[PDB]
């Protein structure tokens, strides 16, 4: 009851929950950066091949194919591939790499968007065309001496990130770009019929990392969210710690 005591409990729990939110933020960050570093290394190894090894399709198969395969295995990626301007893609898939002409690669965001930036492009999660798993794709237009070779893609199962987030301490969770729930420590929050408005509205009012109160079934809860890339990361807890 004494306001000194309530303030002490509030300040403690704000610190604790902030810390835990930041661990889930770090988890998302480190997943991305590891995948980006991998993709960058692969780009470098492909671009360091002589032009002769890159300028016929049979040479791409025989010289780039093994690189795609070893890299895929190193990280247990689902697919690793190189898309060419003739519409063919050299594909190393979890199951030697094949040059596929039937995958409509120029319709794909991972292909188109890699040509519009000099960075790595990271897709939202989507259902892979070939293996029918949900993946996050990292793509990169590879140039040698300023000349485009093709677009590299690396597909990592989105489950990998979901699992990493779920293992974190705290009642933390992630929304995707469209404010749909994406990952959670408590698997029940993944019910698509849960309304997240209260938290999402309190986030909009308060901003990144700003602790707020809200109600659930007439009881008080405390939480915070923050943007992490296109995701929104949140933590919530009961306010019993400060009230009882
Ligand atoms: C090669 C390319 C078609 C991949 C299978 C990519 N994950 C996609 O679904 O667009
Ligand atoms: Na890294
Ligand atoms: Na690796
Ligand atoms: Na957690």
Coordinates of N, CA and C and ligand atoms in Angstrom, one line a residue:
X1 N 0.8 -1.2 0.0 CA 0.0 0.0 0.0 C 0.9 1.3 0.0
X2 N 1.8 1.4 0.9 CA 2.6 2.6 1.1 C 3.2 3.0 -0.3
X3 N 3.0 4.2 -0.8 CA 3.5 4.5 -2.2 C 5.0 4.3 -2.4
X4 N 5.8 4.5 -1.4 CA 7.2 4.1 -1.5 C 7.4 2.7 -1.9
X5 N 6.7 1.8 -1.3 CA 6.8 0.4 -1.6 C 6.3 0.0 -3.0
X6 N 5.2 0.6 -3.3 CA 4.6 0.3 -4.7 C 5.5 0.9 -5.8
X7 N 6.1 2.1 -5.6 CA 7.1 2.6 -6.5 C 8.3 1.7 -6.6
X8 N 8.8 1.2 -5.5 CA 9.9 0.3 -5.6 C 9.6 -1.0 -6.4
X9 N 8.4 -1.5 -6.2 CA 8.0 -2.7 -6.9 C 7.8 -2.4 -8.4
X10 N 7.2 -1.3 -8.7 CA 7.0 -0.9 -10.1 C 8.3 -0.7 -10.8
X11 N 9.3 0.0 -10.2 CA 10.5 0.3 -10.8 C 11.3 -1.0 -11.0
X12 N 11.3 -1.9 -10.1 CA 12.0 -3.2 -10.2 C 11.4 -4.0 -11.4
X13 N 10.1 -4.1 -11.4 CA 9.5 -4.9 -12.5 C 9.6 -4.3 -13.9
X14 N 9.6 -3.0 -13.9 CA 9.9 -2.3 -15.2 C 11.3 -2.7 -15.7
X15 N 12.3 -2.6 -14.8 CA 13.6 -3.0 -15.2 C 13.7 -4.4 -15.7
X16 N 13.1 -5.3 -14.9 CA 13.1 -6.8 -15.2 C 12.5 -7.0 -16.6
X17 N 11.3 -6.5 -16.8 CA 10.6 -6.8 -18.0 C 11.3 -6.1 -19.2
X18 N 11.8 -4.9 -19.0 CA 12.6 -4.2 -20.1 C 13.8 -5.1 -20.5
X19 N 14.5 -5.6 -19.5 CA 15.6 -6.5 -19.8 C 15.2 -7.7 -20.7
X20 N 14.1 -8.3 -20.3 CA 13.6 -9.5 -21.0 C 13.1 -9.2 -22.4
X21 N 12.5 -8.1 -22.5 CA 12.1 -7.6 -23.9 C 13.4 -7.5 -24.7
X22 N 14.4 -6.9 -24.2 CA 15.6 -6.7 -24.9 C 16.3 -8.0 -25.3
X23 N 16.2 -9.0 -24.5 CA 16.7 -10.4 -24.9 C 16.0 -10.9 -26.1
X24 N 14.6 -10.7 -26.2 CA 13.9 -11.1 -27.4 C 14.2 -10.2 -28.6
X25 N 14.4 -8.9 -28.4 CA 15.0 -8.1 -29.5 C 16.3 -8.6 -30.0
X26 N 17.2 -8.9 -29.1 CA 18.6 -9.4 -29.5 C 18.5 -10.7 -30.2
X27 N 17.5 -11.5 -29.8 CA 17.4 -12.8 -30.5 C 17.0 -12.6 -32.0
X28 N 16.1 -11.7 -32.2 CA 15.7 -11.4 -33.6 C 16.9 -10.8 -34.4
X29 N 17.6 -9.8 -33.8 CA 18.7 -9.2 -34.4 C 19.8 -10.2 -34.8
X30 N 20.2 -11.1 -33.8 CA 21.3 -11.9 -34.0 C 20.9 -13.0 -35.1
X31 N 19.7 -13.4 -35.2 CA 19.2 -14.3 -36.2 C 19.4 -13.7 -37.6
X32 N 19.0 -12.4 -37.7 CA 19.1 -11.7 -39.0 C 20.6 -11.6 -39.4
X33 N 21.4 -11.0 -38.5 CA 22.8 -10.7 -38.8 C 23.6 -12.0 -39.1
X34 N 23.4 -13.1 -38.4 CA 24.1 -14.3 -38.8 C 23.7 -14.7 -40.2
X35 N 22.4 -14.6 -40.6 CA 22.0 -15.0 -42.0 C 22.6 -14.0 -43.0
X36 N 22.7 -12.7 -42.7 CA 23.3 -11.8 -43.6 C 24.7 -12.0 -43.7
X37 N 25.5 -12.3 -42.7 CA 26.9 -12.5 -42.8 C 27.1 -13.7 -43.7
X38 N 26.4 -14.8 -43.5 CA 26.4 -16.0 -44.3 C 26.2 -15.7 -45.8
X39 N 25.2 -14.9 -46.1 CA 24.9 -14.5 -47.4 C 26.0 -13.7 -48.1
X40 N 26.5 -12.8 -47.3 CA 27.6 -12.0 -47.8 C 28.9 -12.8 -48.1
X41 N 29.2 -13.8 -47.2 CA 30.3 -14.7 -47.5 C 30.1 -15.5 -48.8
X42 N 28.9 -16.0 -49.0 CA 28.6 -16.7 -50.2 C 28.7 -15.9 -51.4
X43 N 28.2 -14.6 -51.3 CA 28.3 -13.7 -52.5 C 29.8 -13.6 -52.8
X44 N 30.6 -13.3 -51.8 CA 32.1 -13.1 -52.0 C 32.7 -14.3 -52.7
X45 N 32.4 -15.5 -52.3 CA 33.0 -16.7 -52.9 C 32.5 -16.9 -54.3
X46 N 31.3 -16.6 -54.6 CA 30.8 -16.7 -56.0 C 31.5 -15.7 -56.9
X47 N 31.5 -14.4 -56.4 CA 32.1 -13.3 -57.2 C 33.6 -13.5 -57.5
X48 N 34.3 -14.2 -56.6 CA 35.7 -14.4 -56.7 C 36.1 -15.5 -57.7
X49 N 35.1 -16.2 -58.2 CA 35.4 -17.1 -59.3 C 35.8 -16.3 -60.6
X50 N 36.6 -16.9 -61.4 CA 36.9 -16.2 -62.7 C 35.6 -16.1 -63.5
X51 N 35.6 -15.1 -64.4 CA 34.4 -15.0 -65.3 C 34.2 -16.3 -66.1
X52 N 35.3 -16.9 -66.5 CA 35.1 -18.1 -67.3 C 34.2 -19.1 -66.6
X53 N 34.3 -19.2 -65.3 CA 33.5 -20.2 -64.5 C 32.0 -19.8 -64.3
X54 N 31.7 -18.5 -64.6 CA 30.4 -17.9 -64.4 C 29.6 -17.7 -65.6
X55 N 30.2 -17.8 -66.8 CA 29.5 -17.3 -68.0 C 28.9 -18.3 -69.0
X56 N 29.0 -19.6 -68.6 CA 28.2 -20.6 -69.2 C 27.3 -21.3 -68.1
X57 N 26.2 -21.8 -68.5 CA 25.3 -22.4 -67.6 C 25.9 -23.7 -67.0
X58 N 26.6 -24.5 -67.9 CA 27.2 -25.7 -67.4 C 28.3 -25.4 -66.4
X59 N 29.1 -24.3 -66.7 CA 30.1 -23.9 -65.7 C 29.5 -23.4 -64.4
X60 N 28.4 -22.7 -64.5 CA 27.6 -22.3 -63.2 C 27.3 -23.5 -62.5
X61 N 26.7 -24.5 -63.1 CA 26.3 -25.8 -62.4 C 27.5 -26.4 -61.7
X62 N 28.6 -26.6 -62.5 CA 29.8 -27.3 -62.0 C 30.6 -26.5 -61.0
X63 N 30.7 -25.2 -61.1 CA 31.6 -24.4 -60.3 C 30.8 -23.7 -59.1
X64 N 29.6 -23.1 -59.4 CA 28.9 -22.5 -58.4 C 28.1 -23.5 -57.5
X65 N 27.6 -24.6 -58.2 CA 26.8 -25.6 -57.5 C 27.4 -26.1 -56.2
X66 N 28.7 -26.6 -56.3 CA 29.2 -27.1 -55.1 C 29.3 -26.1 -53.9
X67 N 29.6 -24.8 -54.3 CA 29.6 -23.8 -53.3 C 28.2 -23.6 -52.6
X68 N 27.2 -23.6 -53.4 CA 25.8 -23.5 -52.9 C 25.5 -24.6 -51.9
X69 N 25.9 -25.8 -52.3 CA 25.7 -27.0 -51.5 C 26.4 -27.0 -50.2
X70 N 27.7 -26.7 -50.2 CA 28.5 -26.7 -49.0 C 28.0 -25.6 -48.0
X71 N 27.7 -24.4 -48.6 CA 27.1 -23.4 -47.8 C 25.7 -23.8 -47.2
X72 N 24.9 -24.4 -48.0 CA 23.6 -24.9 -47.5 C 23.8 -25.8 -46.3
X73 N 24.7 -26.8 -46.5 CA 24.9 -27.7 -45.4 C 25.5 -27.1 -44.2
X74 N 26.4 -26.1 -44.4 CA 27.0 -25.5 -43.2 C 26.1 -24.9 -42.2
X75 N 25.0 -24.4 -42.7 CA 24.0 -23.7 -41.9 C 22.7 -24.4 -41.8
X76 N 22.5 -25.6 -42.5 CA 21.3 -26.3 -42.6 C 20.2 -25.4 -43.1
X77 N 20.5 -24.6 -44.2 CA 19.4 -23.9 -44.9 C 18.6 -24.8 -45.7
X78 N 17.4 -24.4 -46.0 CA 16.4 -25.2 -46.8 C 16.8 -25.2 -48.2
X79 N 17.0 -24.0 -48.8 CA 17.4 -23.9 -50.2 C 18.5 -22.8 -50.3
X80 N 19.4 -23.0 -51.2 CA 20.4 -21.9 -51.5 C 20.5 -22.0 -53.1
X81 N 20.4 -20.8 -53.7 CA 20.2 -20.7 -55.2 C 20.8 -19.5 -55.8
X82 N 21.0 -19.6 -57.1 CA 21.4 -18.4 -57.9 C 20.5 -18.3 -59.1
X83 N 19.8 -17.2 -59.2 CA 18.8 -16.9 -60.3 C 19.5 -16.1 -61.3
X84 N 19.3 -16.4 -62.6 CA 19.9 -15.8 -63.7 C 18.9 -15.0 -64.6
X85 N 19.4 -14.0 -65.3 CA 18.5 -13.2 -66.1 C 17.8 -13.9 -67.2
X86 N 18.2 -15.1 -67.6 CA 17.5 -15.9 -68.5 C 16.3 -16.6 -67.9
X87 N 16.0 -16.4 -66.6 CA 14.9 -17.0 -65.9 C 15.3 -18.4 -65.3
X88 N 16.4 -18.9 -65.5 CA 16.8 -20.2 -64.9 C 17.4 -19.9 -63.5
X89 N 17.3 -20.9 -62.6 CA 17.8 -20.8 -61.3 C 18.6 -22.1 -60.9
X90 N 19.8 -21.9 -60.5 CA 20.6 -23.0 -60.0 C 20.2 -23.3 -58.5
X91 N 19.6 -24.4 -58.2 CA 19.0 -24.7 -56.9 C 19.6 -25.8 -56.2
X92 N 20.1 -25.5 -55.0 CA 20.6 -26.5 -54.1 C 19.5 -26.7 -53.0
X93 N 18.9 -27.8 -52.9 CA 17.7 -28.0 -52.0 C 17.9 -29.1 -51.1
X94 N 17.4 -28.9 -49.9 CA 17.4 -29.9 -48.9 C 16.6 -31.1 -49.4
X95 N 17.2 -32.2 -49.3 CA 16.6 -33.5 -49.8 C 17.0 -34.7 -49.0
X96 N 23.1 -33.5 -57.4 CA 23.7 -32.2 -57.3 C 22.7 -31.1 -57.7
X97 N 23.1 -29.9 -57.4 CA 22.2 -28.8 -57.8 C 21.8 -28.8 -59.2
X98 N 20.6 -28.4 -59.5 CA 19.9 -28.5 -60.8 C 19.6 -27.1 -61.3
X99 N 19.7 -26.9 -62.6 CA 19.4 -25.6 -63.2 C 17.9 -25.8 -63.7
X100 N 17.0 -25.1 -63.0 CA 15.6 -25.2 -63.2 C 15.1 -24.0 -64.0
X101 N 14.3 -24.3 -65.0 CA 13.7 -23.3 -65.9 C 12.2 -23.0 -65.6
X102 N 11.6 -23.6 -64.6 CA 10.2 -23.7 -64.4 C 9.7 -22.9 -63.2
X103 N 10.5 -22.1 -62.6 CA 10.2 -21.5 -61.3 C 9.8 -20.0 -61.3
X104 N 9.6 -19.4 -62.5 CA 9.1 -18.1 -62.6 C 9.8 -17.1 -61.8
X105 N 11.1 -17.1 -61.8 CA 11.9 -16.3 -60.8 C 11.7 -14.8 -60.9
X106 N 11.5 -14.3 -62.1 CA 11.4 -12.9 -62.3 C 10.0 -12.3 -61.7
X107 N 9.1 -13.1 -61.3 CA 7.9 -12.7 -60.6 C 8.1 -12.6 -59.2
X108 N 9.2 -13.1 -58.7 CA 9.4 -13.2 -57.2 C 10.0 -11.9 -56.6
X109 N 9.5 -11.5 -55.5 CA 10.0 -10.4 -54.7 C 11.5 -10.6 -54.4
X110 N 11.9 -11.7 -54.0 CA 13.3 -11.9 -53.6 C 14.2 -11.6 -54.8
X111 N 13.8 -11.9 -56.0 CA 14.6 -11.6 -57.2 C 14.5 -10.1 -57.5
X112 N 13.2 -9.6 -57.7 CA 13.0 -8.2 -58.1 C 13.7 -7.2 -57.2
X113 N 13.5 -7.5 -55.9 CA 13.9 -6.5 -54.9 C 15.4 -6.5 -54.7
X114 N 16.1 -7.6 -54.9 CA 17.5 -7.6 -54.9 C 18.2 -6.8 -56.0
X115 N 17.5 -6.6 -57.1 CA 18.0 -5.8 -58.2 C 17.7 -4.3 -57.9
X116 N 17.0 -3.9 -56.9 CA 16.6 -2.5 -56.6 C 17.4 -2.0 -55.4
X117 N 18.2 -2.8 -54.7 CA 19.1 -2.3 -53.6 C 20.5 -3.0 -53.8
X118 N 21.5 -2.3 -53.3 CA 22.8 -2.9 -53.1 C 23.0 -3.6 -51.8
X119 N 22.0 -3.7 -51.0 CA 22.0 -4.5 -49.8 C 21.5 -5.9 -50.0
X120 N 21.6 -6.7 -49.0 CA 20.8 -7.9 -48.8 C 19.3 -7.5 -48.6
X121 N 18.4 -8.2 -49.3 CA 17.0 -8.1 -49.1 C 16.5 -9.2 -48.3
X122 N 15.6 -8.9 -47.3 CA 15.0 -9.9 -46.5 C 13.5 -9.9 -46.6
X123 N 13.0 -11.0 -47.1 CA 11.6 -11.1 -47.3 C 10.8 -11.4 -46.0
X124 N 9.5 -11.0 -45.9 CA 8.6 -11.6 -44.9 C 8.6 -13.1 -45.1
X125 N 8.2 -13.8 -44.1 CA 8.0 -15.2 -44.2 C 6.9 -15.6 -45.2
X126 N 7.2 -16.6 -46.0 CA 6.2 -17.1 -47.0 C 6.5 -18.6 -47.3
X127 N 5.5 -19.2 -47.9 CA 5.5 -20.6 -48.2 C 6.4 -20.9 -49.4
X128 N 7.5 -21.6 -49.1 CA 8.4 -21.9 -50.2 C 7.7 -22.7 -51.4
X129 N 8.0 -22.3 -52.6 CA 7.4 -22.9 -53.8 C 7.8 -24.4 -53.9
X130 N 9.0 -24.7 -53.6 CA 9.5 -26.1 -53.9 C 9.3 -27.1 -52.8
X131 N 9.6 -26.7 -51.6 CA 9.5 -27.6 -50.4 C 8.3 -27.4 -49.5
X132 N 7.6 -26.3 -49.8 CA 6.3 -26.0 -49.0 C 6.6 -26.0 -47.5
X133 N 7.6 -25.3 -47.1 CA 7.8 -24.8 -45.8 C 7.9 -23.3 -45.7
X134 N 7.5 -22.7 -44.6 CA 7.6 -21.3 -44.4 C 9.1 -20.9 -44.2
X135 N 9.5 -20.0 -45.0 CA 10.9 -19.5 -45.1 C 11.0 -18.0 -45.0
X136 N 12.1 -17.5 -44.5 CA 12.6 -16.2 -44.7 C 13.7 -16.3 -45.7
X137 N 13.6 -15.4 -46.7 CA 14.6 -15.4 -47.8 C 15.5 -14.2 -47.7
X138 N 16.8 -14.5 -47.8 CA 17.8 -13.4 -47.9 C 18.4 -13.5 -49.3
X139 N 18.2 -12.4 -50.0 CA 18.7 -12.3 -51.4 C 19.7 -11.2 -51.6
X140 N 20.5 -11.4 -52.6 CA 21.6 -10.4 -52.9 C 22.0 -10.5 -54.4
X141 N 21.9 -9.4 -55.1 CA 22.4 -9.4 -56.5 C 23.9 -9.4 -56.4
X142 N 24.5 -10.4 -57.1 CA 25.9 -10.6 -57.1 C 26.5 -10.0 -58.4
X143 N 27.5 -9.1 -58.2 CA 28.2 -8.4 -59.3 C 29.7 -8.8 -59.2
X144 N 30.3 -8.9 -60.4 CA 31.7 -9.1 -60.5 C 32.2 -8.0 -61.5
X145 N 33.1 -7.1 -61.0 CA 33.6 -6.0 -61.8 C 32.5 -5.2 -62.3
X146 N 31.4 -5.1 -61.5 CA 30.2 -4.2 -61.9 C 29.2 -4.9 -62.8
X147 N 29.5 -6.1 -63.2 CA 28.7 -6.9 -64.1 C 27.8 -7.9 -63.2
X148 N 26.5 -7.8 -63.4 CA 25.6 -8.7 -62.7 C 25.8 -10.2 -63.1
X149 N 26.0 -11.1 -62.1 CA 26.0 -12.5 -62.4 C 24.6 -13.1 -62.2
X150 N 24.0 -12.8 -61.1 CA 22.6 -13.3 -60.9 C 22.2 -12.9 -59.5
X151 N 21.1 -13.3 -59.0 CA 20.6 -13.0 -57.7 C 20.7 -14.3 -56.8
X152 N 21.5 -14.2 -55.8 CA 21.6 -15.2 -54.8 C 20.5 -15.2 -53.8
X153 N 19.9 -16.4 -53.5 CA 18.9 -16.5 -52.5 C 19.3 -17.6 -51.5
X154 N 18.9 -17.3 -50.2 CA 19.1 -18.3 -49.1 C 17.8 -18.3 -48.3
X155 N 17.2 -19.5 -48.3 CA 16.0 -19.7 -47.5 C 16.2 -20.4 -46.2
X156 N 15.9 -19.7 -45.1 CA 16.0 -20.3 -43.8 C 14.5 -20.5 -43.2
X157 N 14.3 -21.7 -42.7 CA 12.9 -21.9 -42.1 C 12.6 -20.9 -41.1
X158 N 11.4 -20.2 -41.3 CA 10.9 -19.3 -40.3 C 10.7 -19.9 -38.9
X159 N 10.5 -21.2 -38.9 CA 10.4 -21.9 -37.6 C 11.7 -21.7 -36.8
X160 N 12.8 -21.6 -37.5 CA 14.1 -21.5 -36.7 C 14.0 -20.2 -35.8
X161 N 13.5 -19.1 -36.4 CA 13.4 -17.9 -35.6 C 12.3 -18.0 -34.5
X162 N 11.2 -18.6 -34.9 CA 10.1 -18.8 -34.0 C 10.6 -19.6 -32.7
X163 N 11.3 -20.6 -33.0 CA 11.8 -21.5 -31.9 C 12.8 -20.7 -31.0
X164 N 13.7 -19.9 -31.6 CA 14.6 -19.2 -30.8 C 13.9 -18.2 -29.9
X165 N 12.8 -17.5 -30.5 CA 12.1 -16.6 -29.6 C 11.3 -17.3 -28.5
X166 N 10.7 -18.4 -28.8 CA 9.9 -19.1 -27.8 C 10.8 -19.5 -26.7
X167 N 12.0 -19.9 -26.9 CA 12.9 -20.4 -25.8 C 13.4 -19.2 -24.8
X168 N 13.2 -18.0 -25.2 CA 13.6 -16.9 -24.4 C 12.9 -16.8 -23.1
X169 N 13.5 -16.3 -22.0 CA 12.7 -16.0 -20.8 C 11.7 -14.9 -21.0
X170 N 10.7 -14.9 -20.1 CA 9.7 -13.9 -20.1 C 8.6 -14.3 -21.1
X171 N 7.4 -13.6 -20.8 CA 6.2 -13.8 -21.6 C 6.3 -12.8 -22.8
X172 N 7.3 -13.2 -23.7 CA 7.6 -12.3 -24.8 C 7.0 -13.0 -26.1
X173 N 6.8 -12.1 -27.1 CA 6.1 -12.5 -28.3 C 6.4 -11.5 -29.4
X174 N 6.2 -11.9 -30.6 CA 6.5 -11.1 -31.8 C 5.3 -11.1 -32.7
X175 N 5.1 -9.9 -33.3 CA 4.1 -9.7 -34.4 C 4.9 -9.5 -35.7
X176 N 4.4 -9.9 -36.8 CA 4.9 -9.6 -38.1 C 4.5 -8.3 -38.6
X177 N 4.9 -8.0 -39.8 CA 4.7 -6.8 -40.5 C 3.2 -6.3 -40.5
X178 N 2.3 -7.3 -40.6 CA 0.9 -7.1 -40.7 C 0.2 -7.2 -39.3
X179 N 1.0 -7.1 -38.3 CA 0.5 -7.2 -36.9 C -0.2 -8.5 -36.6
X180 N 0.2 -9.6 -37.2 CA -0.3 -10.9 -36.9 C 0.8 -11.6 -36.0
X181 N 0.3 -12.3 -35.1 CA 1.2 -13.0 -34.1 C 2.1 -13.9 -34.9
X182 N 3.4 -14.0 -34.6 CA 4.4 -14.7 -35.3 C 5.2 -15.7 -34.4
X183 N 5.5 -15.3 -33.2 CA 6.2 -16.2 -32.3 C 5.9 -15.8 -30.9
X184 N 6.0 -16.8 -30.0 CA 5.6 -16.5 -28.6 C 6.3 -17.6 -27.7
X185 N 6.7 -17.2 -26.5 CA 7.1 -18.1 -25.5 C 6.0 -19.0 -25.0
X186 N 4.8 -18.4 -24.8 CA 3.6 -19.1 -24.4 C 2.8 -19.5 -25.7
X187 N 2.9 -20.7 -26.1 CA 2.3 -21.1 -27.4 C 0.8 -20.8 -27.5
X188 N 0.1 -20.5 -26.4 CA -1.3 -20.2 -26.5 C -1.6 -18.9 -27.2
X189 N -0.7 -17.9 -27.2 CA -0.9 -16.6 -27.8 C -0.9 -16.7 -29.3
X190 N -0.5 -17.9 -29.8 CA -0.5 -18.1 -31.3 C -1.9 -18.5 -31.8
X191 N -2.9 -18.6 -30.9 CA -4.3 -18.7 -31.4 C -4.7 -17.5 -32.2
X192 N -5.1 -17.7 -33.5 CA -5.4 -16.6 -34.4 C -6.6 -15.8 -34.0
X193 N -7.3 -16.4 -33.1 CA -8.5 -15.7 -32.7 C -8.4 -14.8 -31.4
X194 N -7.2 -14.9 -30.8 CA -6.9 -13.9 -29.8 C -6.9 -12.5 -30.4
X195 N -7.6 -11.5 -29.7 CA -7.5 -10.1 -30.0 C -6.3 -9.4 -29.3
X196 N -5.3 -8.9 -30.1 CA -4.2 -8.2 -29.5 C -4.3 -6.7 -29.5
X197 N -5.4 -6.1 -29.8 CA -5.6 -4.7 -29.8 C -5.2 -3.9 -28.5
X198 N -5.5 -4.4 -27.3 CA -5.1 -3.8 -26.1 C -3.6 -3.5 -26.0
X199 N -2.8 -4.5 -26.3 CA -1.4 -4.3 -26.3 C -1.0 -3.4 -27.4
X200 N -1.5 -3.8 -28.6 CA -1.0 -3.0 -29.8 C -1.4 -1.5 -29.7
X201 N -2.6 -1.3 -29.1 CA -3.0 0.1 -28.9 C -2.2 0.9 -27.9
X202 N -1.9 0.1 -26.8 CA -1.1 0.7 -25.8 C 0.4 1.0 -26.3
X203 N 0.9 0.0 -27.1 CA 2.2 0.3 -27.8 C 2.1 1.6 -28.7
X204 N 1.1 1.7 -29.5 CA 0.9 2.9 -30.3 C 0.9 4.2 -29.5
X205 N 0.3 4.2 -28.4 CA 0.2 5.4 -27.5 C 1.5 5.7 -26.8
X206 N 2.3 4.6 -26.4 CA 3.4 4.8 -25.6 C 4.8 4.9 -26.3
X207 N 4.9 4.1 -27.4 CA 6.1 4.1 -28.2 C 7.1 3.0 -27.7
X208 N 8.3 3.0 -28.3 CA 9.2 1.8 -28.1 C 9.7 1.8 -26.7
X209 N 9.6 0.6 -26.1 CA 10.2 0.4 -24.8 C 9.6 1.1 -23.7
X210 N 8.4 1.7 -23.9 CA 7.7 2.4 -22.8 C 6.6 1.6 -22.2
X211 N 6.9 1.4 -20.9 CA 6.1 0.4 -20.1 C 4.7 1.0 -19.9
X212 N 3.7 0.2 -20.0 CA 2.3 0.6 -19.9 C 1.4 -0.4 -19.1
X213 N 0.3 0.1 -18.6 CA -0.7 -0.7 -17.9 C -1.9 -0.9 -18.9
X214 N -2.5 -2.1 -18.8 CA -3.7 -2.4 -19.5 C -4.6 -3.4 -18.8
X215 N -5.8 -3.7 -19.2 CA -6.7 -4.6 -18.5 C -7.0 -5.8 -19.3
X216 N -7.2 -7.0 -18.6 CA -7.6 -8.2 -19.2 C -8.5 -8.9 -18.2
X217 N -9.8 -9.1 -18.6 CA -10.8 -9.7 -17.8 C -10.9 -8.9 -16.4
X218 N -10.8 -7.6 -16.5 CA -10.9 -6.7 -15.5 C -9.8 -6.6 -14.5
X219 N -8.7 -7.3 -14.8 CA -7.5 -7.3 -14.0 C -6.4 -6.5 -14.7
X220 N -5.5 -6.0 -13.9 CA -4.4 -5.1 -14.5 C -3.2 -5.9 -14.9
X221 N -2.7 -5.5 -16.0 CA -1.4 -6.1 -16.6 C -0.5 -5.0 -16.9
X222 N 0.8 -5.3 -17.1 CA 1.8 -4.4 -17.5 C 2.6 -4.9 -18.7
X223 N 3.0 -4.0 -19.5 CA 3.8 -4.5 -20.7 C 4.6 -3.4 -21.4
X224 N 5.3 -3.9 -22.4 CA 6.0 -2.9 -23.3 C 6.2 -3.6 -24.6
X225 N 6.3 -2.8 -25.7 CA 6.7 -3.4 -27.0 C 7.8 -2.5 -27.6
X226 N 8.4 -3.0 -28.7 CA 9.3 -2.2 -29.4 C 9.4 -2.8 -30.8
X227 N 9.7 -1.9 -31.8 CA 9.9 -2.3 -33.2 C 11.2 -3.0 -33.3
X228 N 11.3 -4.1 -34.0 CA 12.5 -4.8 -34.3 C 12.4 -5.2 -35.8
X229 N 13.1 -4.4 -36.6 CA 12.9 -4.5 -38.1 C 11.5 -4.3 -38.4
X230 N 10.8 -5.1 -39.2 CA 9.4 -4.9 -39.4 C 8.5 -5.6 -38.4
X231 N 9.1 -6.3 -37.4 CA 8.4 -7.0 -36.4 C 8.1 -6.0 -35.2
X232 N 7.1 -6.4 -34.4 CA 6.9 -5.8 -33.2 C 7.1 -6.8 -32.0
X233 N 8.0 -6.5 -31.1 CA 8.3 -7.4 -30.0 C 7.6 -6.9 -28.8
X234 N 7.0 -7.7 -28.0 CA 6.3 -7.3 -26.8 C 6.6 -8.3 -25.6
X235 N 6.3 -7.7 -24.4 CA 6.3 -8.5 -23.2 C 5.1 -8.0 -22.4
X236 N 4.4 -8.9 -21.7 CA 3.4 -8.5 -20.7 C 3.5 -9.4 -19.5
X237 N 2.9 -8.9 -18.4 CA 2.9 -9.7 -17.2 C 1.7 -9.2 -16.4
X238 N 1.3 -9.9 -15.4 CA 0.3 -9.5 -14.4 C 0.8 -8.3 -13.6
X239 N 0.0 -7.4 -13.2 CA 0.3 -6.3 -12.3 C 0.2 -6.7 -10.8
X240 N 0.0 -8.0 -10.5 CA -0.1 -8.4 -9.1 C 1.2 -8.1 -8.4
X241 N 2.4 -8.1 -9.1 CA 3.6 -7.7 -8.4 C 3.6 -6.4 -7.8
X242 N 2.9 -5.4 -8.4 CA 2.9 -4.1 -7.8 C 1.6 -3.8 -6.9
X243 N 0.6 -4.7 -7.1 CA -0.7 -4.4 -6.4 C -0.8 -5.3 -5.2
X244 N -0.3 -6.5 -5.2 CA -0.4 -7.5 -4.1 C 0.9 -7.6 -3.4
Ligands
LIG1 C1 14.2 -20.8 -56.2 C2 13.0 -20.1 -55.7 C3 11.7 -20.4 -56.5 C4 12.8 -20.6 -54.2 C5 12.1 -22.0 -54.1 C6 12.0 -19.5 -53.4 N1 12.0 -19.9 -52.0 C7 10.6 -19.2 -53.8 O1 9.7 -19.9 -53.4 O2 10.4 -18.3 -54.6
LIG2 NA1 27.4 -12.4 -38.0
LIG3 NA1 27.9 -21.7 -41.9
LIG4 NA1 10.4 -15.3 -23.7

